[PDB]
Design a protein around this motif. Structure first.
Motif, PDB file in Angstrom:
ATOM      1  N   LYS A 155      37.694  39.773  52.752  1.00 52.46           N
ATOM      2  CA  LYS A 155      38.305  40.713  51.816  1.00 52.46           C
ATOM      3  C   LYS A 155      39.826  40.720  51.910  1.00 52.46           C
TER       4      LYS A 155
ATOM      5  N   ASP B 107      39.478  47.017  40.125  1.00 51.91           N
ATOM      6  CA  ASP B 107      38.276  46.475  40.746  1.00 51.91           C
ATOM      7  C   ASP B 107      37.066  47.307  40.342  1.00 51.91           C
ATOM      8  OD1 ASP B 107      39.119  48.714  42.428  1.00 51.91           O
ATOM      9  OD2 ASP B 107      37.566  48.042  43.828  1.00 51.91           O
ATOM     10  N   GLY B 108      35.883  46.791  40.676  1.00 50.40           N
ATOM     11  CA  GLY B 108      34.628  47.421  40.307  1.00 50.40           C
ATOM     12  C   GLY B 108      34.023  48.247  41.424  1.00 50.40           C
TER      13      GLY B 108
ATOM     14  N   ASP C 189      30.376  45.278  36.319  1.00 45.46           N
ATOM     15  CA  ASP C 189      31.461  46.181  36.689  1.00 45.46           C
ATOM     16  C   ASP C 189      32.803  45.633  36.226  1.00 45.46           C
ATOM     17  OD1 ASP C 189      29.293  47.315  38.163  1.00 45.46           O
ATOM     18  OD2 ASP C 189      29.838  46.053  39.883  1.00 45.46           O
ATOM     19  N   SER C 190      33.095  44.374  36.566  1.00 46.94           N
ATOM     20  CA  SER C 190      34.332  43.736  36.134  1.00 46.94           C
ATOM     21  C   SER C 190      34.342  43.437  34.641  1.00 46.94           C
ATOM     22  CB  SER C 190      34.558  42.452  36.931  1.00 46.94           C
ATOM     23  OG  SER C 190      33.380  41.670  36.957  1.00 46.94           O
TER      24      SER C 190
ATOM     25  N   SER D 234      35.044  39.054  37.852  1.00 45.47           N
ATOM     26  CA  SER D 234      34.181  38.197  38.653  1.00 45.47           C
ATOM     27  C   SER D 234      32.938  37.733  37.910  1.00 45.47           C
ATOM     28  CB  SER D 234      33.755  38.913  39.948  1.00 45.47           C
ATOM     29  OG  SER D 234      33.376  40.260  39.699  1.00 45.47           O
TER      30      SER D 234
ATOM     31  N   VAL E 125      43.251  43.230  35.925  1.00 49.42           N
ATOM     32  CA  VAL E 125      41.825  43.473  36.154  1.00 49.42           C
ATOM     33  C   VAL E 125      41.221  42.262  36.857  1.00 49.42           C
ATOM     34  N   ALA E 126      40.401  42.516  37.879  1.00 45.45           N
ATOM     35  CA  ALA E 126      39.749  41.461  38.661  1.00 45.45           C
ATOM     36  C   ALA E 126      38.372  41.125  38.093  1.00 45.45           C
ATOM     37  CB  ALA E 126      39.648  41.872  40.125  1.00 45.45           C
TER      38      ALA E 126
ATOM     39  N   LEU F 190      45.980  38.953  45.462  1.00 49.55           N
ATOM     40  CA  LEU F 190      46.149  39.758  44.255  1.00 49.55           C
ATOM     41  C   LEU F 190      47.426  40.594  44.291  1.00 49.55           C
TER      42      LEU F 190
ATOM     43  N   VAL G 299      46.303  46.752  40.475  1.00 46.50           N
ATOM     44  CA  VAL G 299      45.175  45.827  40.441  1.00 46.50           C
ATOM     45  C   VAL G 299      43.890  46.646  40.392  1.00 46.50           C
TER      46      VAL G 299
ATOM     47  N   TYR H 232      42.591  40.273  48.553  1.00 47.86           N
ATOM     48  CA  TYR H 232      43.504  41.343  48.156  1.00 47.86           C
ATOM     49  C   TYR H 232      44.965  40.990  48.415  1.00 47.86           C
TER      50      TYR H 232
END
Ligand SMILES: [Co+2]
Ligand SMILES: [Co+2]
Ligand SMILES: [Co+2]
Ligand SMILES: [Co+2]
Ligand SMILES: [Co+2]
Ligand SMILES: [Co+2]
Lengths: 243, 249, 245, 250, 225, 239
Positions: E92, E113-114, E21-22, E17, E14-15, E99, E111, E96
């Protein structure tokens, strides 16, 4: 033909010998009373300033002494404009039936003191045309640039709206709610806003201020509300659009 | 010497020239000259001239025409294209000179075509004036502002444009080329802000950014106009309309 | 009666006095008296006097010196010891008497030493070692503005100054330090764009009286007014929520 | 005496009724009643009802739907035309009566058509209700405002629409005919003002006058929006848009 | 349906931040896959604030996740350093691609993301965040610093830190929602329009302070946020 | 982690078996009262709420009900801080003899009902602060336990409104106490009315003074009726 418009203007003055001028303190009627005094003399000119419930007791007191400063025997008469059904109910042409009620009073003073005409500073027929008024300024093609010029030419240095505008078209004016508005505006004038109107909406007062002033006005909110409420309004409001 | 000495010394040169042409502005200096020339020489030997240009406001221009018509002077209007001069268009520290030089050179033509012995203006107690044969009749009589305010009040002069708005080149950084477009871009912005109830305002040009300088006392009053000024000055060509947190200069 | 009449009564008394001494302060009323005396008696029969003291700002004094010379008046500056009177320094309700006596008696000395029939001043309707020549002609505040407009008078002090002693409680002795402490506080606030202001003294607390219309505009200067008046000796700089009196 | 003795009295009547229909209004009290009914009777013997109507905002209604679905209740919505009542359309001082009467009278139809023993509501220990029969179970067990907050914390109840909204008819003077148009005229004005950042606001109706009631602390912050609030509410039909100098509920 | 995709992956990454959302994504992966089968990554860069890094580091340890931080030099990308309108692309990609390397080194199936795959809305994410008990989250909008600069203004450690410093100050004065726009010698302050009335008193202090940070002019954007 | 700080909290909680909590209605003492009640039960936890001249009778009545809402055996005790000469004259060390007068009552209540310690919130044991609890974590666990009501107004001791060496009296305390709740009523929870005999000095956060403009006249008249000759706003704001 600049001094030939004074020639057309002076020409009619000698024709009437004796006049009665409707003094409003404004630059136009101040120009008319002075030219009548310098051509016909202080005794052949009767200045009239109309007092009413629709004007502030200060606005009337201003023009009376402004007439005395030019040295004219000025007479003040009082008019009950509310006596006109057209005015008391405030129709969109109420100014007409108002200007008509005025000139007939001036035509009485002119006829009772021996005047050849009634002079002034310039729905049905014209309000003047019907009462036989003489608007010598417009008959001589005076412009906004000419009157301001001749006032300096004559040495004129001092020169100065009606409360029916604070009420909607078709809202009955009464002796009570006019003082309700008149007193409210005098309060806001004292609080530091000389330019203000308190609009009548029955149980609602709508306060119009220049939008620059709305910030400076913020602190008086509760006090204006409570004061104008004591004067009979249920709600004291600020028009978000300002003046 | 006395204020009485300086009134006569002032009139002394006035009758010497018989017929004059005054460079009339709204300020007390040009108004005192226009009034004293009218009170000494009459309207027929006095021609007031009010300069119109892209660099000054049309509201101040129309105002000076009326102070000349109210003072009773045969007022004539001339128009100046300062932007045609390279020194003015680029906004150099000497741009006021070649503007003042282009100005007085115009009046000596008007003076020769209406029969004037000299041109009068409101300088009291720089070189470009003393190059075109221009008389600073107030300075010739050692008039100070205490004397100009004294004699203007003596003649009954109370009405004059006190807002002697600086040249619009001041809204621009040094060395930013003036154009017919971006000059009017400033004038329209300031006329709007002046219309809303703030007579003291400058809209500084910074390419895609407008910088509004307002007196810090007034910024409280200005809050209500925020959304409108942004959108208004954006329509006038600025990408960003901003208020300078530092106020007037 | 008419404004035309009150002017006559004024000149009438001036010819009776032939030679006068006008106590010029800078306000619209004393400005009207100095001009009317010069236009009726001439520059040589009129002596304008501007009093300097510890109770008034050295700036309000300089205005009346230049405003008197600008009207074309023989201007004389006198310096006054209001604090030299024991009754004033301790700031008793009798400060107004012993201050006004020292003023009028100082001018009454100039009157005998400059050859004037009377001392004149600008007092309107709504001591007597001097002639209030406007109230004798029943001028009101609205008439003085009227006669000033007729004569072309354009320079006059639009904010009537006042004695600095009011800033201190009754019975708090004035000192040259706390007097200047208040004057300097007001001079700063005056410079920021609030010409009508009082800095009320309460030892280590400054209480700022501002017109309630202006307090919204004042928000931006809060930190600066605090920091400046703190440096001038106040421990607390405050704004009176009630505004000017 | 204590709370745990009233939570007893509350559970007692719930098992007694076996199947109920709850009038959910998103408030803290109605949230406690729907939760206790789900935990005593199970999801199948409890029907939550949230009324959508012209007197409450289409925005406030959708939230009570989400709070009922989140508590795990079979929520069914009914819609009422309050203006169909002669007394409500004219907005008389008793319009609240015939309005709450129309409310309970609809719920008793839903209760009779889905087989419930009673209609529940969050009225507690603080006049047309029981003439249709709705039982104030919390008030019957001597629950107070402090007791509802106490038992809600005991049950893990943390989300509820705290701003229990009022009926839009309060925005109109007594004796002002409500129409499908001017109700939305006020609702849209209030929704705009809520969108600009003043969540507590009422737009009072006065024919061609809008009267804006704002908390008087907020009026300083509101100056910047003056012209925008004026023109937007003008497009919504008002000739004059005003701010009440007396502020909220003057 | 939401938990369903989590069981498909057995082990996920999980990313985190700092945003809501994250925060919702990292917690739900732990409640479905366990504390040992979720590897969180919080991005360190020249484009992000030292507090947003501290925000996600403190929030990840509180949610019970083995949090791993990696650091990226976005300014090293030619498109970003000069900051063209496509810098977000070159930005971006650097994230990625990093990751995708870490996912293979921690034994993860994917992986995360939100979030968008389950049709979560701004009104829906807030529902599960209160339902899941999340009370600590970066309520302040975390964002890339390039937006404070015009397209095509060379970003430097000096003028980037010049902008970054203004925003942290103004956030301290009581305006957490703020952006300071760079225009060489002009600072443009974007504030929520409601707050501009409240901000009035700080005028001279903000001017004098932000002048010290190198700006010749400190201005307020009349249009706000 | 965090879920550790809770197990560490209960670990210390069971070690103490029976406690007495110093409840001040704030969220921190609320987190302590809930966790202690949930680990030891209502009969092994006695909440104590202090009534005194230095805190508002409104803050006291609020903190009493917040203890009953969490289900705690709440006992009210009364403290005479003004009876202490060091406090009544408000010396720079008056804060000391005040905190001693407080805990001395709570250490008595703990022994008279059989408590192992006296508990309190922060960041006489302090179990929250003892477990390296932070401000961001305390708000998190309050939602985890279902806690929604708490006095987010940590009303400090009223002695700060008076200069050092101004004798506090029951009367001038009420002059200050009443002035602040009025200002709190208009929508400003963070405010102090500083006492200076006939001058009130109002401290407001400088952000709020913009919002404050309209209430100027009303604040003056109310606080003037409450005994101040002059009501002023401190240009320096809060602190
Ligand atoms: Co009648
Ligand atoms: Co060209
Ligand atoms: Co203002
Ligand atoms: Co219908
Ligand atoms: Co006692
Ligand atoms: Co605010």
């Amino acid at each position: 033909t600049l001094a030939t418009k004074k020639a057309t203007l002076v020409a009619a003055l000698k024709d009437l010998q004796r006049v009665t001028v409707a003094f409003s303190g404004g630059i136009d009627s101040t120009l008319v009373l002075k030219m009548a005094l310098d051509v016909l003399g202080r005794d052949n000119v009767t200045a009239v300033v109309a007092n009413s419930e629709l004007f502030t007791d200060e606005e009337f007191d201003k023009a009376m002494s402004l007439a005395e400063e030019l040295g004219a025997n000025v007479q003040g008469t009082t008019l009950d404009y509310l006596s006109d059904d057209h005015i008391k109910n405030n129709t969109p042409d109420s100014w007409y039936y108002a200007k008509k009620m005025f000139y007939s009073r001036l035509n009485d003073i002119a006829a009772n003191n021996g005047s050849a005409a009634v002079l002034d500073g310039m729905p049905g027929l014209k309000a003047r045309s019907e009462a036989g008024a003489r608007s010598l300024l417009q008959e001589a093609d005076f412009f906004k640039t000419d009157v301001r010029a001749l006032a300096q030419e004559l040495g004129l240095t001092n020169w100065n709206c009606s409360v029916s505008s604070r009420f909607p078209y078709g809202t009955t004016l009464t002796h009570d709610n006019i003082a309700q508005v008149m007193a409210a505006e005098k309060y806001l004038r004292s609080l530091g806003f000389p330019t203000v109107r308190v609009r009548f909406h029955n149980d609602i007062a709508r306060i119009e201020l220049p939008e620059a002033r709305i910030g400076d006005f913020l602190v008086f909110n509760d006090r204006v509300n409570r004061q104008l409420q004591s004067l009979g309004f249920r709600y004291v409001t600020l028009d978000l659009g300002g003046f």
